[PDB]
Amino acid sequence: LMSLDTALNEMLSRVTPLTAQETLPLVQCFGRILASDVVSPLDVPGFDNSAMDGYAVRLADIASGQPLPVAGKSFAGQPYHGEWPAGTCIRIMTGAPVPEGCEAVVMQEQTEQMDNGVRFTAEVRSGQNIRRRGENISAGAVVFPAGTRLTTAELPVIASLGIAEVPVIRKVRVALFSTGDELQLPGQPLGDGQIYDTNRLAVHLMLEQLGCEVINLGIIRDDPHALRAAFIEADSQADVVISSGGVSVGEADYTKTILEELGEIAFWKLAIKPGKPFAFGKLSNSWFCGLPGNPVSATLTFYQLVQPLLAKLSGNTASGLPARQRVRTASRLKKTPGRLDFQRGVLQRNADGELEVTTTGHQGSHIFSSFSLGNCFIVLERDRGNVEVGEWVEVEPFNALFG
Amino acid sequence: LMSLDTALNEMLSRVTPLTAQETLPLVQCFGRILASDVVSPLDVPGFDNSAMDGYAVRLADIASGQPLPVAGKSFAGQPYHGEWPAGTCIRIMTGAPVPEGCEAVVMQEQTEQMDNGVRFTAEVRSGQNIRRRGENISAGAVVFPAGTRLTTAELPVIASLGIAEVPVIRKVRVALFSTGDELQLPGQPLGDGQIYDTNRLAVHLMLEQLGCEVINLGIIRDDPHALRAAFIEADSQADVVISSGGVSVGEADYTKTILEELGEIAFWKLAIKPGKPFAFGKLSNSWFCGLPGNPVSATLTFYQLVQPLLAKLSGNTASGLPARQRVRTASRLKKTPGRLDFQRGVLQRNADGELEVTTTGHQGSHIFSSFSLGNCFIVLERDRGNVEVGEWVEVEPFNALFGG
Numbered sequence: 001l002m003s004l005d006t007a008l009n010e011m012l013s014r015v016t017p018l019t020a021q022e023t024l025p026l027v028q029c030f031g032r033i034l035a036s037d038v039v040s041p042l043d044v045p046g047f048d049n050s051a052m053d054g055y056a057v058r059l060a061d062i063a064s065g066q067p068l069p070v071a072g073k074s075f076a077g078q079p080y081h082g083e084w085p086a087g088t089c090i091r092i093m094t095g096a097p098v099p100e101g102c103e104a105v106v107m108q109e110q111t112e113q114m115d116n117g118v119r120f121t122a123e124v125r126s127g128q129n130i131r132r133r134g135e136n137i138s139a140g141a142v143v144f145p146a147g148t149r150l151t152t153a154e155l156p157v158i159a160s161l162g163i164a165e166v167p168v169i170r171k172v173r174v175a176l177f178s179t180g181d182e183l184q185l186p187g188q189p190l191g192d193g194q195i196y197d198t199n200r201l202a203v204h205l206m207l208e209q210l211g212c213e214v215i216n217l218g219i220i221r222d223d224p225h226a227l228r229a230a231f232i233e234a235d236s237q238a239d240v241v242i243s244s245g246g247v248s249v250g251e252a253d254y255t256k257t258i259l260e261e262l263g264e265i266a267f268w269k270l271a272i273k274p275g276k277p278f279a280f281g282k283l284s285n286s287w288f289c290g291l292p293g294n295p296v297s298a299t300l301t302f303y304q305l306v307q308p309l310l311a312k313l314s315g316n317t318a319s320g321l322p323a324r325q326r327v328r329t330a331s332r333l334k335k336t337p338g339r340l341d342f343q344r345g346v347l348q349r350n351a352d353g354e355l356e357v358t359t360t361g362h363q364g365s366h367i368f369s370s371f372s373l374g375n376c377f378i379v380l381e382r383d384r385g386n387v388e389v390g391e392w393v394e395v396e397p398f399n400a401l402f403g
Numbered sequence: 404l405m406s407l408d409t410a411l412n413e414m415l416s417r418v419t420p421l422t423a424q425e426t427l428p429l430v431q432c433f434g435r436i437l438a439s440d441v442v443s444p445l446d447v448p449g450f451d452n453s454a455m456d457g458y459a460v461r462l463a464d465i466a467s468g469q470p471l472p473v474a475g476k477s478f479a480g481q482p483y484h485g486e487w488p489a490g491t492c493i494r495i496m497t498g499a500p501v502p503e504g505c506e507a508v509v510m511q512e513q514t515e516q517m518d519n520g521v522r523f524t525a526e527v528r529s530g531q532n533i534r535r536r537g538e539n540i541s542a543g544a545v546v547f548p549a550g551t552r553l554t555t556a557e558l559p560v561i562a563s564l565g566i567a568e569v570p571v572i573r574k575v576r577v578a579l580f581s582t583g584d585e586l587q588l589p590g591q592p593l594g595d596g597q598i599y600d601t602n603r604l605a606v607h608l609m610l611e612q613l614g615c616e617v618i619n620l621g622i623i624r625d626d627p628h629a630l631r632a633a634f635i636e637a638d639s640q641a642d643v644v645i646s647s648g649g650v651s652v653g654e655a656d657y658t659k660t661i662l663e664e665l666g667e668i669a670f671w672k673l674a675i676k677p678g679k680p681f682a683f684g685k686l687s688n689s690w691f692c693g694l695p696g697n698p699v700s701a702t703l704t705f706y707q708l709v710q711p712l713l714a715k716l717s718g719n720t721a722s723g724l725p726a727r728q729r730v731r732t733a734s735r736l737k738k739t740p741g742r743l744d745f746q747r748g749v750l751q752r753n754a755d756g757e758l759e760v761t762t763t764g765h766q767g768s769h770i771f772s773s774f775s776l777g778n779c780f781i782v783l784e785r786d787r788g789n790v791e792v793g794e795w796v797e798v799e800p801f802n803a804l805f806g807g
Binding site: 047299 | 456596605728729
């Protein structure tokens with residue numbers, strides 16, 4: 001019934017990004033979100049420097065046609081500061097400051113040795129092989145705006161400005177638990193009718209990799225007093241509280257009366273598969289996301305709704321649902337109109353070098369193993385039906401959460 | 404002169420994957436390499452159970468056509484063990500075990516509650532809505548082989564088997580350092596021809612995001628005595644030693660002579676762009692990789708060469724290439740034959756829904772912004788010249804090191 005689109009727009013419209021900040025050296029900032037504009041205090045490069053090894057010259061001396069004796073050498077980190085007489089040149093290495101009065105740098109290839117000094121054999125242009133102060137970044141300019149997620153692409157540039165540390169938004173705090181007397185912890189023996197809990201570890205892992213601060217409360221006892229106490233504890237400690245399974249996503253059980261007693265909760269029926277049910281709303285001090293019990297459904301609902309919620313709350317301004325592309329299927333796909341079906345597939349290059357996708361197998365939410373067998377979603381349109389080999393299909397490669 | 408391929412193969416053929424192992428709880432295993440096969444001790448699911456909220460019936464009772472009174476209820480984790488008389492049904496919840504003799508589960512909405520019992524309104528087919536013991540995993544089977552990188556796809560399947568911790572290969576230990584009197588620690592004042600050391604941070608970040616244990620020795624003082632000391636420390640404590648800049652990758656100087664004193668090091672000139680020079684070889688107890696000083700070159704060189712080395716060392720049995728595909732350019736590309744040019748580009752969907760790439764801009768190595776602006780490399784073949792709009796082009800999307 002409710003489109004994924006519409007549901008996510010709704011959830012994000014309710015939410016306001018965190019503003020609370022902390023200051024961290026750059027090496028600890030991978031994947032963190034800049035709280036304030038990074039404004040450069042320096043010109044970069046901060047001084048006119050050689051783009052290569054060769055010789056620093058004045059055009060008037062080149063103009064002579066005469067060989068120029070080498071007055072001195074200039075190293076990166078150890079510039080020449082001796083006298084530079086008229087009619088001479090300076091040997092210079094990549095990255096060294098050009099000497100006062102230098103108008104060009106000639107690479108070795110365009111010179112010959114004379115029994116005396118250096119002949120320049122090619123035209124020498126004003127400014128050739130010189131990187132000028134301020135050509136990359138002007139002091140005073142904003143280099144990265146607030147809301148920028150810091151990776152290897154950004155943090156080295158920040159260091160080239162001489163900044164050792166930056167303010168970033170604190171991590172989003174997410175409390176996490178499951179419930180049901182059928183759920184058991186790994187390493188313990190299974191009682192009557194029990195299964196091992198998997199969703200909660202699947203959610204924890206993903207939160208960790210998303211950079212959140214995870215407060216896992218474990219498996220809560222299927223008792224109203226214990227469950228209430230768990231919600232209250234979760235709420236007091238976190239920005240977001242997630243049930244990885246066991247709390248109602250619509251069914252009229254005791255968990256639903258506790259949830260509604262503690263918050264203002266919507267129970268939605270989404271036009272997706274796998275899954276459909278999702279619970280979302282506001283507790284006293286936190287947002288609540290309630291996932292369906294099936295492992296495929298809970299994982300997919302997490303990945304497609306909760307994941308982007310957390311990106312917005314983190315302060316990230318990257319306006320991006322992950323990347324999709326159009327590719328032909330090498331498999332016949334069973335699909336029923338009425339829901340957007342996030343089937344799992346294997347995307348691969350064929351012998352012609354063209355990109356195609358294969359089903360991973362049975363798509364039932366009775367097996368989590370399609371995530372490991374796969375490397376992408378095949379995102380089958382709400383209204384589309386079965387798909388034949390050769391048709392074009394929307395594909396969404398899995399992110400680093402799945403490898 | 405030297406192909407990137409020939410270099411990569413040379414580096415990979417030399418190296419032996421680590422086998423040493425340590426056992427960790429599942430929650431601490433993200434991105435770790437599974438050290439032993441995971442074998443299922445149990446059937447998943449463990450028992451025949453309901454796929455719906457409803458009723459568990461036998462087909463003979465359905466065929467009588469009579470309302471069946473509710474004789475009991477089976478809940479998830481609270482199965483029914485009482486008597487199940489003839490002509491009767493058992494209320495059942497999703498995931499609850501089916502009661503003995505059960506032939507079908509009927510979903511609640513295909514029933515009417517009748518005062519003399521539950522009336523079944525639809526056809527009932529043998530086995531409907533029953534998940535069978537072992538239909539996902541069988542006891543005794545290997546679920547993941549040794550060599551699997553563990554992520555969200557694998558670890559929860561491991562949890563489903565009742566296994567709380569697994570053996571993984573120890574992390575690759577990478578020692579790191581730079582040198583040159585030009586280099587200054589950020590947060591300090593820049594003297595005369597100085598710059599802030601950026602390559603070292605870039606490599607530290609990438610190494611940690613790759614799951615390496617990093618030993619950062621700093622900026623090494625630019626003389627032979629301090630350099631020897633740095634090499635001895637680095638080599639004594641690591642599987643791999645990396646110079647992020649300042650140590651020779653071919654030019655004759657004191658750093659070169661120390662390298663040749665302490666190791667068996669090759670200086671390659673690679674048919675690539677950006678970059679070209681790369682130092683590689685064996686120190687007494689470790690492998691060495693020496694990067695060029697230019698940030699664009701170092702970063703590219705680490706990404707295309709050191710990264711695949713670390714993957715093999717780690718024990719990851721994944722095929723190490725590629726995630727490449729062929730896409731049209733929507734940009735004219737300037738490309739000189741003779742080098743494999745890893746231009747940076749922007750991969751985006753056009754209005755027809757087709758994937759296409761655009762240049763980031765100037766492809767010079769004098770700036771670093773192409774890594775921010777870009778989301779891929781346009782991998783232009785060694786012998787190719789200029790590329791016009793609409794030609795086909797190979798493309799390698801950025802991995803998580805640049806944010807995807």
